[PDB]
């Protein structure tokens, strides 16, 4: 059972594709954010989060993503492996991106502060 | 580079050299570097309608028509890639001439020295 900090560090390294030494500032920022008191998530109820996600997807005319989400939610509920379904649903909702909206390519301008 | 362009813009707007606007540049870099929640509206037409409504609310119907015409021209020109974002920015920076600018109290100047 790898400590959550080590697992998060490995996840960050894997997702960004950089060594631990190159992500030190980002690691510090992440540690500060995770240790910082964050306001409660918009929805902490599994059924309320699922309903809000469905309503948001239908309102955005993203029916395919809504169907995929409904299927994944049904599978998660039937599998019964996750103890805190509401937390996972809230995370997925927070990470949802509209596939129709072209990913806002982070302007090169962010690089000015990196130095 | 976008950073150099922003610096030149700041220098031009403030009328000071790049060296005199270093703190404002740092503040801008900090603001831009902060993670922002997704914008409320990413649709060009919704932003245009909001801008028109905001201009009408200030009883500036002529300015509202001028804004609608300029927005139509910008959309047809196709030079801007993110029309909704630019329209939202312009609406957000619009000021009602009837609403007296909340004059930054002279007291802020006391600490500048």
């Amino acid at each position: 059972q790898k400590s959550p900090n080590v697992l998060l560090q490995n996840l960050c390294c894997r997702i960004l594709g950089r060594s631990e030494a190159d992500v030190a500032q980002q690691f510090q920022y992440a540690v500060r954010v995770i240790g910082s008191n964050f306001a409660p998530t918009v929805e902490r109820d599994e059924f309320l989060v699922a309903e809000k996600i469905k309503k948001e997807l239908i309102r955005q005319r993203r029916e395919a993503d809504a169907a995929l989400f409904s299927e994944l939610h049904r599978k998660l509920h039937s599998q019964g492996v996750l103890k805190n379904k509401w937390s996972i649903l809230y995370l997925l909702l927070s990470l949802s991106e509209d596939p129709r909206r072209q990913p806002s390519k982070v302007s090169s301008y962010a690089t000015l502060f990196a130095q | 580079s976008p950073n150099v362009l922003l610096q030149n813009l700041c220098c031009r707007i403030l009328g000071r050299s790049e060296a005199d606007v270093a703190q404002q540049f740092q503040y801008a870099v900090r603001v831009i570097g902060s993670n922002f929640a997704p914008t409320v509206e990413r649709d060009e037409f919704l932003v245009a309608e909001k801008i028109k409504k905001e201009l009408i609310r200030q009883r500036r119907e002529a300015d509202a028509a001028l804004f609608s015409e300029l927005h139509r021209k910008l959309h047809s020109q196709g030079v801007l890639k993110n029309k909704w974002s630019i329209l939202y920015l312009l609406l957000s920076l619009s000021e009602d001439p009837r609403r007296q600018p909340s004059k930054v109290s002279s007291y802020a100047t006391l600490f500048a020295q």
Binding site: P40, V42, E43, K52, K55, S94 | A37
Partner: peptide, 28 residues
């Protein structure tokens, strides 16, 4: 008088709008 169905619809719409606003504020 707003019918029970119309009353329920208006209540649900207001609740949805307020939930969306609360969610947006929480995310912000």
């Amino acid at each position: 008088p707003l019918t029970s169905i119309q009353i329920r619809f208006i209540q649900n719409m207001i609740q949805e709008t307020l939930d969306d606003f609360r969610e947006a504020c929480h995310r912000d």
